[PDB]
Amino acid sequence: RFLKVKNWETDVVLTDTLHLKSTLETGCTEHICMGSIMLPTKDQLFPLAKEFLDQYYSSIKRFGSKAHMDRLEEVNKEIESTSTYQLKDTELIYGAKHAWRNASRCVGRIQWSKLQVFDARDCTTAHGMFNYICNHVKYATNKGNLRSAITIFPQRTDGKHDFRVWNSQLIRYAGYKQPDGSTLGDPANVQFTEICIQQGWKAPRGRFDVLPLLLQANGNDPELFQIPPELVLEVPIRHPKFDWFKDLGLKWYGLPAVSNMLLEIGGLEFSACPFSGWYMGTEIGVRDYCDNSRYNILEEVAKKMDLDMRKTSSLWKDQALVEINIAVLYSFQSDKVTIVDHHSATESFIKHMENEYRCRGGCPADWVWIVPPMSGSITPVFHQEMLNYRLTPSFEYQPDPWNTHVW
């Protein structure tokens, strides 16, 4: 019931008690581990509200105080009456910081307490959502010195009036199926690119077309908006040693901003909660650039390097991978856009886990996601045992809205 995690590089053992507070289920049973699966009323809401307010009042050293008991009473009356309740600003901020803190797949959580929370609960239209979003993008981008931020749109009601950002990230590149049979641009976004086109976007049909926002307010039909080009910081990719690298024509955007997740706080559901931080270098150079189902540039790069591509055992893929990743980092650094390498981020996370074990009694962590997609065992996280479990407040996946929305 009290659980130990061991670091096999350093022999440091930590004891986890925090898992006992865990509420949601994992996908696993005593018979089967699903650790590598990508995705496994009034009556319901009051318990969730109480659990939340209890931890909030605990966090501000006021557990069992007059004001604690009063608020529990207040929220209780409001659920009875209205079927829902509203969070105080302080609660909303706390809840959003804690959803990040609880994100077991997130290596960047040492930063969790510094999140800037933009309260957009007064938003009513898609044009309003667009304004809030542009403001978030400009604030977070900060001319290259990125700051973490979340923008929180109104909470779900009867669930026929959901706010949604149909985009998977605020800033992403279009993908277009070709006559040819190949894909132009990012193959991850073909379907959404098509949705934008059918809703009426005029696609320029290039390799790196920033997608328009498709914004849904109040369960209404979603609308298109272009993010002012001037607010989208992008980085041309060059290599500090290979002059030819630039001729690949590669670029990426500075601001990673997830917009398709659902934020749950005290039972309330925020279906539009775009959040942003900054990139770990491998996200772009290993996954975006080198996944076979993504930009898949490994072959072209290897060719420019004149490596022996005859045999897998020459490790030509591996050599090319390292160079691509060196270039991503050098390019961001040269243009002064915040980026972290996988060594520094994982070192940060081990230090963060130690803080959380010491200060909170644990840190839920998903090893499959935390270990970087290159050079795993040369980073400290590879050697660190992790316990994965689900705490609330939380960020959750939710169905893509086009499968759900009725026009």
Binding-site annotation: residue ranges? 36, 106, 169, 278-279, 283, 368-369, 382, 397
How far is the C-alpha of 95 from the C-alpha of 100, rounded, in Å? Answer: 9
Tell me the three state secondary structure of residue 404.
coil
Supply 171's token pair.
Answer: 């800033």
Residue 385's binding partner out of ligand H4B, ligand 5H4, Br ion, none, with CB under 5 to 8 Å set by partner kind: ligand H4B
- When CB distances to Zn ion are compared, the closest residue is 33
108 binds ligand HEM (CB under 6 A): yes
In this structure, are residues 282 and 373 in contact, taking their beta carbons and an 8 Å threshold?
yes
- In the complex with ligand H4B, the residue whose CB is nearer, 21 or 294, is 294
Please state the closest distance from residue 148 (CB atom) to ligand HEM, in A: 4
Between the CA of residue 290 and those of 89, 342, 395, what are the distances in Å? 42, 16, 27
- Give the residue, chosen from 20, 24, 33, 315, that forms a contact with Zn ion under the rule CB under 5 A: 33
Pairing of strands 275-276, 149-152: antiparallel
Residue 283's binding partner out of ligand 5H4, Br ion, Zn ion, none, with CB under 5 to 8 Å set by partner kind: ligand 5H4
Q: Is 106 a catalytic residue?
A: yes
- Give the residue, chosen from 102, 141, 276, 331, that forms a contact with ligand 5H4 under the rule CB under 6 A: 276
What b/e readout covers 92-106, taking b as 16+ CB neighbours within 10 angstroms?
Answer: bbbbbbbbbbbbbeb
Q: List the beta strands (DSSP E) in 81-166.
A: 116-119, 149-152, 164-165
Please state the closest distance from residue 369 (CB atom) to ligand H4B, in A: 4
- In the complex with a second copy, the residue whose CB is nearer, 26 or 220, is 26
Residue 348's binding partner out of Br ion, ligand HEM, ligand H4B, none, with CB under 5 to 8 Å set by partner kind: Br ion
In this structure, are residues 153 and 131 in contact, taking their beta carbons and an 8 Å threshold?
no
- In the complex with ligand HEM, the residue whose CB is nearer, 79 or 401, is 401
Q: Is 91 a catalytic residue?
A: no
Q: Is 164 a catalytic residue?
A: no
Please state the closest distance from residue 363 (CB atom) to Zn ion, in A: 17
Partnered with residue 184 across adjacent β-strands are: 176
How far is the C-alpha of 217 from the C-alpha of 153, rounded, in Å? Answer: 9
- Give the residue, chosen from 18, 53, 115, 337, that forms a contact with ligand HEM under the rule CB under 6 A: 115
How far is the C-alpha of 79 from the C-alpha of 77, rounded, in Å? Answer: 6
Tell me which residues in 195-254 interact with ligand H4B (CB under 6 A). none
How far is the C-alpha of 142 from the C-alpha of 361, rounded, in Å? Answer: 35
How far is the C-alpha of 314 from the C-alpha of 336, rounded, in Å? Answer: 35
110 binds ligand 5H4 (CB under 6 A): no
Q: Which amino acid is at 319?
A: Q
Residue 369's binding partner out of ligand 5H4, a second copy, ligand H4B, none, with CB under 5 to 8 Å set by partner kind: ligand H4B
What b/e readout covers 166-196, taking b as 16+ CB neighbours within 10 angstroms?
Answer: bbbbbbbbbbbeeeeeebbbbbbbbebbbbb
Q: How many CB atoms lie within 10 A of CB 299?
A: 14
From the list 174-182, 212-220, 303-311, 336-344, the region that binds Br ion by CB under 5 A is 336-344
Q: How many CB atoms lie within 10 A of CB 4?
A: 10
Supply 370's token pair.
Answer: 């935390």
368 binds ligand H4B (CB under 6 A): yes
- In the complex with a second copy, the residue whose CB is nearer, 113 or 377, is 377
Residues in contact with a second copy by the rule CB under 8 A: 3, 5-6, 8-9, 19, 22, 25-38, 281, 286-287, 290-293, 298, 312-315, 317-319, 321-322, 325-326, 329, 333, 341, 343-344, 347, 366-368, 371-378, 382-389
Catalytic residue selected from 101, 106, 252, 316: 106
Residue 257's binding partner out of a second copy, ligand H4B, ligand 5H4, none, with CB under 5 to 8 Å set by partner kind: ligand 5H4
Q: Is 283 a catalytic residue?
A: yes
274 binds ligand 5H4 (CB under 6 A): no
Please state the closest distance from residue 188 (CB atom) to Br ion, in A: 24
35 binds Zn ion (CB under 5 A): yes
Backbone angles phi, psi at 173, to 5 degrees: -95, 140
In this structure, are residues 105 and 99 in contact, taking their beta carbons and an 8 Å threshold?
no
Supply 292's token pair.
Answer: 């076979």
Between the CA of residue 373 and those of 37, 56, 312, 333, 360, what are the distances in Å? 16, 36, 19, 21, 29
From the list 53-61, 128-136, 335-343, 379-387, the region that binds ligand H4B by CB under 6 A is 379-387
275 binds ligand 5H4 (CB under 6 A): yes
Catalytic residue selected from 91, 264, 283, 323: 283
What is the set of active-site residues?
106, 109, 278, 283
Binding site for Br ion (CB under 5 A): 108, 340, 345, 348
